[PDB]
């Protein structure tokens, strides 16, 4: 398998690259790309770690060399927000970056599985889909908005609340990735029960977790190391499925049946061709039903902002 | 076990912290310290990863809170070199940093195992030893200069030369950590044989590997991600030994029998109290014997520079 990381010199890209270098299967290839001129030296740095994964780094305006033969492309380029901003406030600076990079993907490796990490994901995935459609190359089973950080945050917060082992709790999270559209399905967590006060408090903590890190870094950026971890988990799940492993399921933001919104994060069975099946969100508590109904107008405005950008 | 990382906000400290958060045994504690005000937010970032390792981050001039109850202290604070400099050119900026931090260690957790990563290690370990002696608290079995990056670099370069699996070759490296004092014992690598031209060429590549990364980053720093990996390996070896695991051996720069120089890196059996035994360097080829004899005057000048700093 070959995995390309676009945005490899940033805080997220370097943590991701380190985890992938040490965790990809033997025989894998990793290519790193950023316009930052340090990028080939980030690759030489990593190439000294004794694992059977070839790594090369590329710089400049042209990502083609990084993209040739890529099976998975992970896009983490983009600016972080500062204290007092929302994710959607990043649209002006990051929209053009995603458009440019996905055009290069569309020409060089149109059959690759593409994971978008760039903020605000609810909108940037819609930009990517429209770029791919305009190129005549869009496959809705191969475009993912990476929401895995919401999952592993939920796993941590639940285990600590409930005295469980963090490695042993998995919570489904649906919706999107913004303060209003992150919906953890606490009613579906096996072996644990919550009071209604616990549900309200946890859902708050989970929805505002990104802001809590931005506040705690005090102008020094947003979550990088935990986001590197979360993206490495998603990328490894992708690589396992593409290699033929059975029963790999992850929640991601994907174009689906449109029953809630055009793009929506839900549980997915992954296979050799991207998403194999979009699984049912199951039965919702009254709290969860209410939260889902309340987010829908905000989500489809997020989506419409991305489509507008590409199409007007 | 509690592990403190001093210098947690730099490139090395953040990679190290990520690997330790994900790899320390369940029940461990990790405390991060840097004067950089982003440091508590680096800890909040990592605290969202679902493993059973408590993490806290501290900022400011006082490292005491990070040091209370620490069993292992890993010191990675310090400036990197730029293209055209040598490691020893970092003495002016980094000597005072190491002195200050090791004074705080000497007051708060004098019984902790201390690993020094700060460049130039041949000299900064001598500074630390003299600070601890002046405090009345020095234990030569608990002070380590971390040389593990030379080991894993050698493992990578040999496996690729010889068509082996990188995970399956271990090469002993003795001496110190500088372009003249890194001596890989290629004659002692099990199952592989080298021509005399291969020995000369590999030993060169290994000795200049740090400069190759500094050149490749072009002013963007030195090795951070591979150094984070190497230090995480050493720290985990330390933690295993302290918990009672048998037969844990690592090469590190340590005060020993003085037969070559006061401090010298050689294979060490680790146990519950730091170093258990300093193992023999074994039999050297003619090349290796010659290289060892040629480095000795440079090494003891490195050591003398550190002692001078503390004692005059």
Curated annotation (Swiss-Prot), chains A, B:
The active site is at residue 177. It catalyses: (S)-malate + NAD(+) = oxaloacetate + NADH + H(+). GO terms for molecular function: L-malate dehydrogenase (NAD+) activity; malate dehydrogenase activity; oxidoreductase activity; protein homodimerization activity. SUPFAM superfamilies: LDH C-terminal domain-like, NAD(P)-binding Rossmann-fold domains. Substrate binds at residues 81, 87, 119, 153. Keywords: NAD, Oxidoreductase, Tricarboxylic acid cycle. Belongs to the LDH/MDH superfamily. MDH type 1 family. This is Malate dehydrogenase. It comes from Escherichia coli (strain K12). The lineage of its organism: Bacteria, Pseudomonadati, Pseudomonadota, Gammaproteobacteria, Enterobacterales.
